[PDB]
Amino acid sequence: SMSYTWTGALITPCAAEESKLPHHNMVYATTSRSASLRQKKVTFDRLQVLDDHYRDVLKEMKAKASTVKAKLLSIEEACKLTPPHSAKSKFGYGAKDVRNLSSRAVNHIRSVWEDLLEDTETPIDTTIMAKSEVFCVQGRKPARLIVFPDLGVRVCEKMALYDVVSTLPQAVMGSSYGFQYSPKQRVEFLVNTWKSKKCPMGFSYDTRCFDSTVTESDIRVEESIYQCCDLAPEARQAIRSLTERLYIGGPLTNSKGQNCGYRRCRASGVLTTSCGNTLTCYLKATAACRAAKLQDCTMLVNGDDLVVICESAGTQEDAAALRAFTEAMTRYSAPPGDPPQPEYDLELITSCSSNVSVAHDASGKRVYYLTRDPTTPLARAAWETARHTPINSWLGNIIMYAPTLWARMILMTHFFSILLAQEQLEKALDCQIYGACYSIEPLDLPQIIERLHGLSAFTLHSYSPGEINRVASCLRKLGVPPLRTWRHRARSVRAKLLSQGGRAATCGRYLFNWAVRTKLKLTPIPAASQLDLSGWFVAGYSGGDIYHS
Numbered sequence: 001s002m003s004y005t006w007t008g009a010l011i012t013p014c015a016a017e018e019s020k021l022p023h024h025n026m027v028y029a030t031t032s033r034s035a036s037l038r039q040k041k042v043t044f045d046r047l048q049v050l051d052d053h054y055r056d057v058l059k060e061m062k063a064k065a066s067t068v069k070a071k072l073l074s075i076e077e078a079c080k081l082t083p084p085h086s087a088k089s090k091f092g093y094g095a096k097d098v099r100n101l102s103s104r105a106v107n108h109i110r111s112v113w114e115d116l117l118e119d120t121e122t123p124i125d126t127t128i129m130a131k132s133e134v135f136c137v138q139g140r141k142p143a144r145l146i147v148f149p150d151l152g153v154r155v156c157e158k159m160a161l162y163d164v165v166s167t168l169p170q171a172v173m174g175s176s177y178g179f180q181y182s183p184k185q186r187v188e189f190l191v192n193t194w195k196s197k198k199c200p201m202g203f204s205y206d207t208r209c210f211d212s213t214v215t216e217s218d219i220r221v222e223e224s225i226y227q228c229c230d231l232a233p234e235a236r237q238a239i240r241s242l243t244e245r246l247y248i249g250g251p252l253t254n255s256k257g258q259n260c261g262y263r264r265c266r267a268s269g270v271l272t273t274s275c276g277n278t279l280t281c282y283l284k285a286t287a288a289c290r291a292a293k294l295q296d297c298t299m300l301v302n303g304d305d306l307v308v309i310c311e312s313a314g315t316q317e318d319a320a321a322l323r324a325f326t327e328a329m330t331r332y333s334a335p336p337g338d339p340p341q342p343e344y345d346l347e348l349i350t351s352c353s354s355n356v357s358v359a360h361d362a363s364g365k366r367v368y369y370l371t372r373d374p375t376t377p378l379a380r381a382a383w384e385t386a387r388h389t390p391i392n393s394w395l396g397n398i399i400m401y402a403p404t405l406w407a408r409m410i411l412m413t414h415f416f417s418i419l420l421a422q423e424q425l426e427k428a429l430d431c432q433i434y435g436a437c438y439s440i441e442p443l444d445l446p447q448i449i450e451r452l453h454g455l456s457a458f459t460l461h462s463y464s465p466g467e468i469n470r471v472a473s474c475l476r477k478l479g480v481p482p483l484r485t486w487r488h489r490a491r492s493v494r495a496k497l498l499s500q501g502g503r504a505a506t507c508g509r510y511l512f513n514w515a516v517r518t519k520l521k522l523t524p525i526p527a528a529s530q531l532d533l534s535g536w537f538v539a540g541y542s543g544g545d546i547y548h549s
């Protein structure tokens with residue numbers, strides 16, 4: 001079974017494509033012009049051999065799934081989960097019509113749903129497009145490819161599966177399900193799991209082109225888990241029909257409506273992508289841990305992103321065991337890109353593109369937090385400054401990386417400076433968190449941050465020398481002014497925000513307290529504990545077309 005087959009029709013754009021900004025020669029956005037390069041990478045044969053460990057784990061997973069009772073969402077509910085700028089239907093209505101419950105949209109959606117009950121076999125058409133993502137040069141990344149069904153189908157997926165994909169992974173995987181954690185909760189789990197071992201070893205495992213390694217068997221095993229839920233009859237049939245007609249594979253159509261080929265692996269743009277990937281990664285890895293005889297494994301899975309922390313049995317012993325792990329994973333159809341390295345320092349493990357590092361609070365107590373190399377964040381921030389973007393990655397990065405030296409010194413200072421200069425401070429902006437779109441007001445940051453990271457996110461200091469160097473290195477490389485310039489700029493943004501009063505004075509006070517030396521005594525913000533953040537860190541939805549507001 002080939003992950004893809006191709007006809008020769010191009011992966012076409014549907015609108016003009018900018019590759020560069022209008023050191024800025026280092027930043028680029030991917031385009032359909034590099035799609036052939038990606039097609040080559042993601043196209044291969046999958047050989048899969050299942051063993052007893054795999055089957056044991058699956059049954060364990062299904063017994064936990066069998067506690068779940070999932071609800072069918074109403075049309076209205078599913079419509080309201082649709083992002084305002086979601087791709088329009090080929091049937092002559094758009095996302096705004098869906099959210100408005102326009103007659104044509106609803107009647108098409110109802111027709112798609114009935115067709116899932118009435119047709120159990122006919123492959124559902126999908127669109128394949130090159131994704132536009134910004135990066136900094138190293139070699140140069142080709143465009144990722146996105147594969148998604150029509151809008152009417154996506155609304156139907158929600159109806160059948162939103163509650164399942166939102167509830168089941170935690171039911172099945174418990175503390176291992178990564179998307180239930182805010183960054184502080186994630187860091188807490190990572191450090192506690194590290195501290196709980198007598199002699200800890202840990203590694204990240206990077207599967208090469210995970211979506212393509214996902215087999216038809218994998219996707220039906222996934223369905224077998226969903227089917228353990230108590231389901232409405234129509235939900236059960238829709239899940240079965242969606243599985244056979246969409247999830248396992250189908251025809252690929254370009255933006256010009258030409259047939260590009262055929263898919264027999266995971267679609268990146270379906271509701272079940274994150275959940276499916278998570279369950280599948282967790283299944284294979286847990287089995288592989290047993291095959292390798294890894295002792296007292298604790299794992300954390302976020303889709304295809306995997307970290308395992310375990311008991312060390314000695315250096316040479318662990319190496320041997322990682323190799324057994326990787327061989328088992330490979331048998332399961334998940335060979336690695338980079339071979340995995342055993343790690344005896346928690347900070348040296350990168351997972352969800354992040355590592356643990358340490359700073360100190362105002363009292364000088366150690367505080368663990370999550371950080372990353374800031375190159376991509378800053379590149380995307382630069383792009384977003386210059387060109388209009390719907391999804392503001394800078395706002396997501398400030399939220400998720402609030403405690404970091406770079407998020408605070410550069411990102412807050414820069415964007416608050418711009419918002420101040422355009423008087424667009426209260427203006428709500430979309431951003432993605434674990435794949436779900438969120439509309440957020442910049443002036444609401446300080447409360448959001450206390451509730452996600454604690455008050456210590458405003459008082460961290462005495463950062464790691466290695467973290468310090470990575471940030472300063474990054475700035476010189478990208479031509480960004482050094483931290484001393486950002487401290488001068490923070491002081492100016494701070495004074496202005498304070499003088500605005502209201503929610504601006506709050507931002508100024510809490511967000512830029514680091515910039516001044518005679519510091520202010522920060523104490524809990526009232527509206528922070530009162531903030532409703534339900535459904536924020538509940539599940540992953542990359543590619544699932546989900547909007548929360």
Ligand SMILES: COc1ccc2c(c1)C=C1Cn3c-2c(C2CCCCC2)c2ccc(cc23)C(=O)NS(=O)(=O)N(C)CCCCN(C)C1=O
Binds near residue numbers: 385478
């Ligand atoms: C590889 O992709 C990147 C990454 C970073 C930058 C850029 C491209 C584009 C850049 C450099 N740059 C960049 C940023 C980023 C920092 C993070 C937030 C987005 C902007 C600057 C911020 C201030 C400044 C300059 C910043 C800044 O104030 N620079 S400056 O010396 O005072 N100068 C007077 C302003 C020039 C504007 C920057 N510029 C032309 C760039 O090409």
